[PDB]
C-alpha cells in the first residue's frame, strides 16, 4: 500500500510521501523497516530528481524536503553536465528561491535549521559545477543581499563556510586536481570582498546567531588565507577580547585563535611577534576575569560537567599547548611577560589533573615537548622550576601499568624531569612513600602507582645516589609488608618490591649477595599458591635474568660455582608447583643464561643438565610410544609430550643456534613421532568423520605436530651453520611433512606446515633447488584448490600460502621455471586471485609477488621463456590491475596497484619487451608495442566504462603513459581518472594538469 510512490506512471502523491517518510522517522518494527526499503527504492530511482521541485513546494514535511534535496545532490554530483542547459539553470533557481523563501520566514528559519543547511549544501554543489565561469556575479550579489536582512546575512555565512570546506578541506580525492585548483584560485581572487563583509559583521554586531555563523566560517578561512588578513588588520584584537567574554561565541573564537597560533610566522618580523604576543596576552586575561582564575580547580569543574565546561576545557588545553609549542620563546626573553608565561603553564598544570585519559594524553604530549626543550636548550630550565616541580607530582600520581603507549610517554617525561632536578624528584617519592606507611594515602591503587613511578626513573641518577635511594625505598616497602596482616595486602607489596628491583639491574649487578637473595626468594614464591604470585615470580625471574645474565654464568667470589649450575640442580624442586607455562618460562630464562657461556664444551654441558628432565620423559615416552601406539589416545600422554616439545621450543628461543646439540638428540625420533601422530589423526577422521578434528583427542594430537614444527622454525630461523641445516635437517623434514600435508583432507591440513616451509626457504632456500621444487609440488596445487572458491574459507592457509610463494619467488625463482606450462598458468591465476582480496594480509602479498615476478622475467633478458611470458600474461596483469584499481572495493591497496601498473607500462615505453604483444593478424605488421598498448587500453576502458568519451580515455592514457616515470604524478592521474568515472561529462583537459 505504501508502494504507490514507487509508481512513476501516474503523478506523485505528496500526501502519501509525507506519510511514508513520517512512518520511517517516527515508526517502529516492521512498518518502519518496510517504509525504509521504499524510501531507498524511491531516491535511487534515476527519475526521482524530476519530482524534487514538487516536494520542495508542496510537501509539509521537513524530512521529505531533505530527502528531495538528497536526490538533487546525487544528480548535481554525477549527471549534472548531462542535463540540457535549460534544466541546469532551472534547478539553480528554485534552490536559491527556496533558500530565500525560508530566510524571510522567521518561524521556518528557527525551527528548520536541518532543512536550510541541506539546501545550503545543495547550493554549493551547484557552485562547484557552475561557479564562477557561469555565475561570475555570485559573490558581489551575496554581499549585497547580506545588508538587506540579518537572517539572510547569517545564512550566507553558512554558505561561505560550506564552500570553503568543499574546496580546501575535502576537495582532494573528491574532484580532479584541475577542478580543485580552479576553485581554489576563484575564491582567492574574491576573498578580499568576503573578508570585508566578515569584518564588518564582527565589528558592527550584534545578533548572537549571526556572530557565531560568521566566526564559524572564519575558522575555515584560517586554513588557507594569507597571513596579512590576520595581522595587517585589527581582527586579532577583536577575537582576543570582544568575543572571549560571551560564552556562545567563546567556544568558536578559541578555535580560531588555535588555528592562528599554529602558524610559522615570519620569524624576523618584529611586528607580527608583538601581534602574536598581544592576542595571547589578551586571551588569558579574559579567561582569568570572565571564566575562571588560575587557582581554579579545573579537575572538579570537568567532573561536574555543567553546560559546555568539558568542551571549553578541552579547547583551552588545545589552545595553550598549540600556542606555547610554537611561540613560548617569545615570552621567555622579556621579563614583563614572565607572569603571562607561567600563568599559561599553571592553567596546563590544573588541566593535567583532570581525570580524562584522552585529555591527559594531550597535555602530556606538550609537557614532553617542554622538558625536552629544557633538557637541551641553555638558560631555560631555571624559568620553569616551579612548573616542573608540580608536574613531577602530577605524573607520579597518574602513572599507569607497564595502554602501554601511555606509560612509555609518562616515563620519558618523568625521566627528563628527574634529570632537571634529581633532589626534588627523590624528595617527592620518599614523601609519597612516607604517607603510604602512615596509612593516610594507603590503597592498592596508590601503592602500585607510586612503585611504577619509582621504577620508571631507573638509570637517571648517579650509581651512588641511586644506592642510597633504592635502599630507602626497599626498606620502607619491606617495613610496609610486615605492617600489613592480610594475606592479600602482603601480596600487593611483595609484587611491588619485586617490580622495583626488576627495574634497577645496575644495583643488582654491583651487589651479588643481594641479587642472590632476590632470586632465592622468587624460588620460594614459585611454591606460593596465592593467585598471581607464581606468575609474578617467574616474570621477575626472567626479567632479571635478561639484564644480569652475565652474573649467573661467571664464578662469584663468595660462591663455589656459577649460580646457573645451582639453579639447574634444584630446578625440579623449584618448578614443582608451577603450571606448564610457568615452567617453560623458567626453562627459557635458564636458556638466556646458558647462552652467555662462550666456552663450547661448558655451554653444551649446561644444556644437557637443563634438558635432563624432558629428555628422560622423552626417551621414556618414545620407548613406550612405539611399543604401544594406542598410548597417543591417552590425554595425559599427549599432554606430557606437548609440554616436552614446548620446553624445547622455550629453550631454543633463548639459545637459537646454540640449541643445535639438544635438537639432534631428539630430532630423528621427533619426526618419527610426527609421522605416528599424523597416522593417528587420519585413522580418527576416517573412523569418526571430519568432526573428529574438533574433538579434544585430535586437537591435542595436532598440538604435537604444530609444536614440533614450531621448534624447527625456531631453530632454522636462528641457525648459523646453514650447511648443517641443509645436510642434516631439511631432508628428513620434507620427507615427513610434505606428503602428509598433501594426502590429508583439507580440514586436516595444518597451515603451520606452509609457515614452516616459508622459514626454510627464507633461510636456506637458495641452497635447495630440488627442495623448493619438491615443496611446490606437494603444497601448491592442493592448497590453491582450498582457497580458489571464495575469500573466506581457510583464512589461515590463505595467508601462509602467499607468504610461501612470495619467498619462493624471491629466493628460488628457478622452481617456477621448472613448473609445467599448465602449472605456471595456475601460478598466475593465483597471483591475480590475491589482488581481489579485501583482506590486506593477502592483497599486499599478491601485488608484491606480481611486481617481483615481472622483475624476475625482466632480468632473464631476451629469451624464449621471458618472451612467452609477455605474450601470455602481460595484458592479463595489466587488466587485472586496472580492475582492482577502479572497481572501488580495493582502495586499501591503491599505492601498490599504481606502482605495479606503472612498472608494466614502463616496460613498453622503454622497449624492454623484444617480441610483439599481439597476433600477426589483428594489427598491421610493423606496429610498435607502444601503439598497440594504447589501442588495447583504449578498447578496454571503453567497454568497462561506456559513459566515458573517447577523448577522456585518449587523454587519460596519453597522460598516463608519458608519466610512467613519476609515481606521485602517475598516482595523481589515476586518482583524477577515479573521480571522472563516477560522473558523466568529465573534462578531458584535466589530465593536462602536469
Amino acid at each position: 500500500s505504501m508502494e504507490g510512490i514507487l509508481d512513476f506512471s501516474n503523478d506523485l502523491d505528496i500526501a502519501l510521501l509525507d506519510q511514508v517518510v513520517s512512518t520511517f522517522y517516527q515508526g517502529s518494527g516492521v512498518q518502519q523497516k518496510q517504509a525504509q526499503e521504499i524510501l531507498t527504492k524511491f531516491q535511487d530511482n534515476p527519475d526521482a530528481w524530476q519530482k524534487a521541485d514538487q516536494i520542495l513546494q508542496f510537501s509539509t514535511n521537513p524530512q521529505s524536503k531533505f530527502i528531495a534535496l538528497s536526490i538533487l545532490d546525487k544528480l548535481i554530483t554525477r549527471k549534472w553536465k548531462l542535463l540540457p542547459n535549460d534544466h541546469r539553470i532551472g534547478i539553480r533557481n528554485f534552490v536559491v528561491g527556496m533558500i530565500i523563501s525560508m530566510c524571510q520566514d522567521d518561524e521556518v528559519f528557527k525551527t528548520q535549521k536541518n532543512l536550510i543547511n541541506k539546501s545550503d549544501l545543495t547550493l554549493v554543489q551547484i557552485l562547484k559545477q557552475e561557479w564562477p565561469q557561469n555565475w561570475p556575479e555570485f559573490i558581489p550579489e551575496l554581499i549585497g543581499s547580506s545588508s538587506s536582512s540579518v537572517n539572510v546575512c547569517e545564512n550566507n555565512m553558512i554558505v561561505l563556510k560550506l564552500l570553503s570546506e568543499e574546496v580546501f578541506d575535502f576537495s582532494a580525492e573528491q574532484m580532479t586536481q584541475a577542478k580543485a585548483l580552479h576553485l581554489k584560485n576563484s575564491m582567492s581572487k574574491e576573498f578580499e570582498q568576503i573578508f570585508k563583509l566578515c569584518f564588518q559583521v564582527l565589528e558592527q554586531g550584534s545578533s548572537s546567531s549571526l556572530i557565531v555563523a560568521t566566526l564559524e566560517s572564519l575558522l575555515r578561512y584560517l586554513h588557507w588565507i594569507p597571513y596579512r588578513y590576520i595581522y595587517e588588520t585589527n581582527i586579532l584584537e577583536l577575537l582576543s577580547t570582544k568575543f572571549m567574554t560571551s560564552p556562545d561565541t567563546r567556544a568558536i573564537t578559541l578555535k580560531c585563535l588555535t588555528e592562528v597560533s599554529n602558524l610559522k610566522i615570519p620569524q624576523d618580523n618584529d611586528l607580527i611577534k608583538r601581534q602574536t604576543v598581544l592576542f595571547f596576552q589578551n586571551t588569558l586575561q579574559q579567561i582569568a576575569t570572565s571564566v575562571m582564575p588560575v587557582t581554579a580547580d579545573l579537575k572538579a569543574t570537568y567532573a561536574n560537567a555543567n553546560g559546555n565546561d568539558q568542551s571549553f576545557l578541552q579547547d583551552l588545553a588545545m589552545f595553550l599547548t598549540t600556542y606555547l609549542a610554537r611561540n613560548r620563546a617569545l615570552l621567555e626573553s622579556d621579563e614583563s611577560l614572565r607572569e603571562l608565561l607561567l600563568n599559561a603553564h599553571q592553567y596546563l598544570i590544573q588541566l593535567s589533573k583532570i581525570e580524562e585519559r584522552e585529555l591527559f594524553k594531550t597535555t602530556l604530549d606538550y609537557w614532553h615537548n617542554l622538558v625536552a626543550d629544557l633538557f637541551y636548550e641553555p638558560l631555560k630550565k631555571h624559568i620553569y622550576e616551579e612548573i616542573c616541580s608540580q608536574l613531577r607530582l602530577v605524573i607520579i600520581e597518574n602513572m599507569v601499568r607497564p595502554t602501554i603507549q601511555l606509560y612509555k610517554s609518562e616515563r620519558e617525561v618523568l625521566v627528563y624531569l628527574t634529570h632537571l632536578n634529581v633532589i626534588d624528584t627523590e624528595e617527592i617519592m620518599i614523601s609519597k612513600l612516607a604517607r603510604q606507611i602512615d596509612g593516610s594515602e594507603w590503597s592498592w591503587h596508590n601503592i602500585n602507582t607510586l612503585s611504577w613511578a619509582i621504577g620508571s626513573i631507573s638509570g637517571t641518577m648517579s650509581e651512588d645516589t641511586e644506592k642510597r635511594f633504592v635502599v630507602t625505598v626497599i626498606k620502607d616497602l619491606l617495613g610496609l609488608c610486615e605492617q600489613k596482616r592480610g594475606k592479600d595486602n602482603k601480596a600487593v607489596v611483595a609484587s611491588d618490591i619485586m617490580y622495583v628491583v626488576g627495574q634497577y639491574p645496575r644495583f643488582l649487578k654491583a651487589h651479588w649477595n643481594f641479587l642472590r637473595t632476590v632470586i632465592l626468594k622468587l624460588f620460594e614464591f614459585m611454591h606460593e599458591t596465592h593467585e598471581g604470585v607464581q606468575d609474578m615470580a617467574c616474570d621477575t625471574f626472567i626479567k632479571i635474568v635478561q639484564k644480569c645474565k652475565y652474573h649467573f654464568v661467571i664464578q662469584q667470589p663468595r660462591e663455589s660455582e656459577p649460580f646457573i649450575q645451582t639453579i639447574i640442580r634444584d630446578i625440579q624442586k623449584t618448578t614443582a608447583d608451577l603450571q606448564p607455562q610457568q615452567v617453560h618460562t623458567f626453562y627459557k630464562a635458564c636458556g638466556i643464561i646458558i647462552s652467555e657461556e662462550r666456552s663450547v664444551a661448558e655451554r653444551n654441558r649446561l644444556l644437557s643438565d637443563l634438558m635432563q628432565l624432558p629428555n628422560m620423559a622423552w626417551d621414556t615416552i618414545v620407548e613406550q610410544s612405539t611399543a604401544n601406539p594406542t598410548l597417543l589416545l591417552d590425554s595425559e600422554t599427549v599432554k606430557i609430550i606437548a609440554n616436552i616439545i614446548k620446553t624445547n621450543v622455550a629453550v631454543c628461543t633463548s639459545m637459537g643456534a646454540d640449541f643445535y646439540p639438544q635438537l639432534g638428540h631428539i630430532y630423528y625420533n621427533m619426526l618419527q613421532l610426527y609421522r605416528a601422530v599424523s597416522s593417528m589423526i587420519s585413522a580418527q577422521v576416517a573412523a569418526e568423520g571430519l568432526i573428529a578434528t574438533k574433538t579434544p583427542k585430535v586437537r591435542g594430537l595436532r598440538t604435537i605436530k604444530k609444536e614440533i614444527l614450531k621448534l624447527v622454525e625456531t631453530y632454522i630461523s636462528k641457525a648459523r651453520n646453514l650447511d648443517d641445516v641443509v645436510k642434516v635437517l631439511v631432508e628428513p623434514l620434507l620427507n615427513a611433512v610434505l606428503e602428509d600435508y598433501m594426502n590429508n583432507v583439507p580440514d586436516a591440513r595444518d597451515a603451520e606446515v606452509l609457515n614452516c616451509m616459508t622459514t626454510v626457504v627464507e633461510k636456506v632456500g637458495h641452497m635447495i633447488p630440488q627442495g623448493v621444487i619438491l615443496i611446490l609440488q606437494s603444497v601448491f596445487e592442493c592448497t590453491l584448490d582450498m582457497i580458489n572458491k571464495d575469500f573466506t574459507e581457510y583464512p589461515e592457509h590463505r595467508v601462509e600460502f602467499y607468504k610461501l610463494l612470495k619467498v619462493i619467488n624471491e629466493k628460488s625463482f628457478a622452481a617456477f621455471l621448472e613448473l609445467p606450462p599448465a602449472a605456471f598458468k595456475l601460478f598466475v591465476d593465483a597471483i591475480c586471485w590475491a589482488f581481489k582480496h579485501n583482506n590486506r594480509d593477502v592483497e599486499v602479498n599478491g601485488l608484491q609477488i606480481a611486481l617481483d615476478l615481472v622483475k624476475n622475467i625482466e632480468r632473464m633478458g631476451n629469451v624464449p621463456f621471458a618472451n612467452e611470458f609477455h605474450k601470455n600474461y602481460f595484458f592479463i596483469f595489466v587488466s587485472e590491475t586496472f580492475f582492482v584499481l577502479t572497481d572501488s572495493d580495493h582502495k586499501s591497496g591503491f599505492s601498490k596497484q599504481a606502482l605495479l601498473l606503472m612498472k608494466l607500462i614502463s616496460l613498453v615505453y622503454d622497449n624492454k619487451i623484444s617480441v610483439p604483444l599481439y597476433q600477426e593478424a589483428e594489427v598491421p605488421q610493423g606496429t610498435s608495442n607502444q601503439v598497440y598498448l594504447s589501442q588495447y587500453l583504449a578498447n578496454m576502458l571503453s567497454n568497462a566504462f561506456p559513459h566515458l568519451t573517447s577523448e577522456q580515455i585518449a587523454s587519460f592514457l596519453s597522460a598516463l603513459t608519458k608519466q610512467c616515470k613519476d609515481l606521485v604524478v602517475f598516482k595523481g592521474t589515476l586518482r583524477d581518472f577515479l573521480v571522472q568515472i563516477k560522473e558523466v561529462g568529465g573534462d578531458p583537459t584535466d589530465y593536462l594538469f602536469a
Binding site: 635502599v471 626497599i474 619491606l478 609488608c481 601480596a491 649477595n513 643481594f514 632476590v518 626468594k521
Partner: peptide, 14 residues
C-alpha cells in the same frame, strides 16, 4: 647497609 637489606628481604612471609 646492604647486608642488612638482604636479611630483611629474605624474611618475607605471609
Amino acid at each position: 647497609m646492604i647486608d642488612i637489606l638482604s636479611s630483611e628481604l629474605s624474611h618475607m612471609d605471609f
